[PDB]
Nucleic acid binder design. Sequence first.
DNA 1: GTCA
Length: 293
Amino acid sequence: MGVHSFWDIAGPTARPVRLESLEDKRMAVDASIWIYQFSHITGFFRRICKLLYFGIRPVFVFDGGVPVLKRETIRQRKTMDMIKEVQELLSRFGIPYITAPMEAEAQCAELLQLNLVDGIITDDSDVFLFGGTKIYKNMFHEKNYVEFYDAESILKLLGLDRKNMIELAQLLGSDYTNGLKGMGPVSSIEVIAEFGNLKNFKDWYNNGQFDKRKQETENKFEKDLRKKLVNNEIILDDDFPSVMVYDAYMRPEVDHDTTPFVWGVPDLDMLRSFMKTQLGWPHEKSDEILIPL
DNA sequence: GTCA
């Protein structure tokens, strides 16, 4: 997920962290993203166990609904009784969960900004756009280490602040915008490097679009860029950059609740029962995995 | 370099 291929750009700044080092950390986890995949009880259970195995204290976050901007965009790119059975599993695991007003990602970012969590576990790079600043990526790949990302390293090493990343999304694409046809990680980062921002990029493109001369006296990088935008027949309007896309990312609907989370030990019997009730499990299988933790 |  995320600004399409934004992870490609943020990429060079990742720093590998052993999962052992995460012991005792309060971590926001976007639950809705998991439900949108996972059978739905099995995946949760495995992932939850990996989490607890390493001593992570997770807070699961759920969507309170999908904003209109996100609905349109996903559709174009092409029971909730499952959500209950999973909050059942969580509660029986002692793990707290909240339902956000709108987006789990944006809410997750707010938990970090309020010191209710230490980091965000996510593979959705839109979390940077909503202002998330301490991201753990590839938590459920089969590895012993995870990739750590923070907004400061991105700032110092790449020269990209939060506004820059929202404008990167309007080139690359994301949960809110399709980006521009023909634009990927490298064209997009270079457009920001050359013009600083999208207004100067639109201006450069409209001012030379029919002025016969400037097009022949342009740098090579420009000459190739103009070509690609024209091949794709792109119209840079007064709608570009989008003010509403900027607004959805900069001020999303979020729950300023400042009440610290509480974590309980799991319950070895409520879980063994649970899995039997639903997944046709024995108390042998259940106990063998859990009891260690 | 950008997409199956």
